[PDB]
Ligand binder design. Sequence first.
Ligand SMILES: [K+]
Ligand SMILES: [K+]
Ligand SMILES: [K+]
Lengths: 91, 91, 91, 91
Amino acid sequence: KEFQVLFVLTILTLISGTIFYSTVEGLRPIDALYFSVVTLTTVGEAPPPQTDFGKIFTILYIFIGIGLVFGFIHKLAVNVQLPSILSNVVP
Amino acid sequence: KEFQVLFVLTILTLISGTIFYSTVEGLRPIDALYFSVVTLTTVGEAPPPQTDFGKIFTILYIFIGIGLVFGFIHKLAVNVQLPSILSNVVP
Amino acid sequence: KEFQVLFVLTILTLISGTIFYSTVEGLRPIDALYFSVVTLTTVGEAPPPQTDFGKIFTILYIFIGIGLVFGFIHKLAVNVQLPSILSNVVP
Amino acid sequence: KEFQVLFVLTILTLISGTIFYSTVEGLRPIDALYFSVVTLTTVGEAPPPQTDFGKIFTILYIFIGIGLVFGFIHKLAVNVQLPSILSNVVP
Ligand SMILES: [K+]
Ligand SMILES: [K+]
Ligand SMILES: [K+]
């Protein structure tokens, strides 16, 4: 399914960021995963990377990841959350 | 109505975040509500949660809440703010 | 015109925020205007309001202003920037 | 191509921001480029400009650049990433 592919791609993208920021920025995996998530969702509740490699990766990560992550959120909202709500609203 | 449902769902989602961050992050409700709002709107004018539970909740909260909150803002703008303005612009 | 109305509405919304944050948060107008702009565009390159009134206003300001500001940016991009670019690309 | 023009325009916009913030805010080019990218993508993982000229430029830069950058990300996602994925999903 479209949703299943987007879900997996999003997980892989977030794992990749988790590995990158935990390695290069010396973050605990949960901090690395959190940073990846608030970066790609554009929430941005975190200070900037300290290293030039962190900054370069983040620049490329944003352009590569944001379209995928927002596609996933759009399909989540449209093909999972919306039918669920409709179903919850029928007496 | 569509707007009435989205409004309520948004309020429930924000109350849920308010309860969570006031409990786990030890925030005053207004700080907890503020954090919930700038998180789900992607404004992100706030430092990150201090606890791992805060970070995990925030990650899940973002993916679950963002589509709802942006749907609400879209319906607010399109079905409430726009007709109001049109009405204000007619002599 | 649609663009002219959205432009004015956006200016009024930003003036309103500029007045609010310069008064309540004690910001210089330019700081107040900057905060209003990065808040409503969801850029969020600024620490949170210090006062509870700042936080409450910001919460309401976001939901009320974001749809207008993004409508303006959409019309700017679509009805001004895009025709300009097309025109620049014709030999 | 539409994608080729949007790509170039985005690069020019980011170069322009890189030049501006490296000059006026005294940032190393990579910091200036990073700030330009997280500003225009609305990620906002960076403190505010220190100078009034930085703040004014950033205000104008956001309204002018955000529509272009999100148009580029939309065309990247829709006309490059989506066909690539479809192609990877066919047995
Ligand atoms: K954002
Ligand atoms: K931020
Ligand atoms: K942000």
